[PDB]
Amino acid sequence: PQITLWKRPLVTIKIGGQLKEALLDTGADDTVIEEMSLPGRWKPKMIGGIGGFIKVRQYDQIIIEICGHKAIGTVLVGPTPVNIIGRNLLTQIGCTLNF
Amino acid sequence: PQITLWKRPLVTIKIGGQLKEALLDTGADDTVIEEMSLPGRWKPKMIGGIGGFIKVRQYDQIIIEICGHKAIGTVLVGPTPVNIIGRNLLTQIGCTLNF
Numbered sequence: 001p002q003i004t005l006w007k008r009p010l011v012t013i014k015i016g017g018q019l020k021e022a023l024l025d026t027g028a029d030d031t032v033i034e035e036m037s038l039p040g041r042w043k044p045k046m047i048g049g050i051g052g053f054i055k056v057r058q059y060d061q062i063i064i065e066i067c068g069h070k071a072i073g074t075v076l077v078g079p080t081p082v083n084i085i086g087r088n089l090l091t092q093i094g095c096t097l098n099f
Numbered sequence: 100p101q102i103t104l105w106k107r108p109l110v111t112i113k114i115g116g117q118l119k120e121a122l123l124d125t126g127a128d129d130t131v132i133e134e135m136s137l138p139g140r141w142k143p144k145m146i147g148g149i150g151g152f153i154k155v156r157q158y159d160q161i162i163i164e165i166c167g168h169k170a171i172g173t174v175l176v177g178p179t180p181v182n183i184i185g186r187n188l189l190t191q192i193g194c195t196l197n198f
């Protein structure tokens with residue numbers, strides 16, 4: 001698809017058996033999702049945004065489905081104001097910026 | 100151009116006759132740049148991200164070039180961790196997400 005940027009580029013994702021709305025975010029190195037449960041081992045991590053840093057849980061090898069495209073990658077879980085699909089997963093679905 | 104997301108989508112911008120590096124950021128509503136001098140009067144603006152909120156100065160109708168594409172619009176100035184080009188100017192340069 002082609003997604004214009006007149007409003008927030010929000011999509012519906014499937015993750016950990018749950019449906020969530022998330023923002024396609026080219027400024028985010030990684031994917032960060034509001035508090036939820038994910039299977040497997042995790043490591044603490046600090047990520048920095050416009051307002052400074054938040055502490056998150058890093059989960060690796062997590063399957064996500066986004067606009068019919070299934071991808072696998074690292075998902076960070078923590079107190080993010082907005083669910084954000086970052087570059088680590090955007091690449092996998094073949095997402096690019098074009099102008 | 101087509102810009103893949105394997106690395107940060109960093110581009111050269113020109114603002115106030117000077118060259119700077121900025122991130123093309125679809126998760127940002129607005130464009131925010133590090134401390135610098137811009138002409139005219141400014142008004143107050145709060146912007147929120149991961150980590151919280153920062154106070155910025157809002158300048159309107161500012162000439163700015165992004166990867167050679169000429170735009171004129173709102174530029175925020177303040178303590179941002181990186182220079183960010185947001186949707187307000189991405190739409191001006193005809194930028195879309197494609198996959």
Ligand SMILES: CC1(C)SCN(C(=O)[C@@H](O)[C@H](Cc2ccccc2)NC(=O)COc2c(F)cccc2F)[C@@H]1C(=O)N[C@H]1c2ccccc2C[C@H]1O
Pocket residue numbers: 023025026027028029030031032047048049050051081082084086124125126127128129130131146147148149179180181183185
């Ligand atoms: C969807 C959000 C609200 S949350 C993430 N986000 C964004 O715009 C995100 O792309 C940011 C961009 C950014 C990178 C580095 C420093 C500072 C900011 N990224 C982040 O918040 C975190 O990204 C990571 C990461 F997860 C891991 C490692 C490194 C990173 F940079 C949105 C936002 O803050 N946007 C606000 C914004 C930003 C600039 C100008 C105006 C405004 C208003 C809001 O729209």
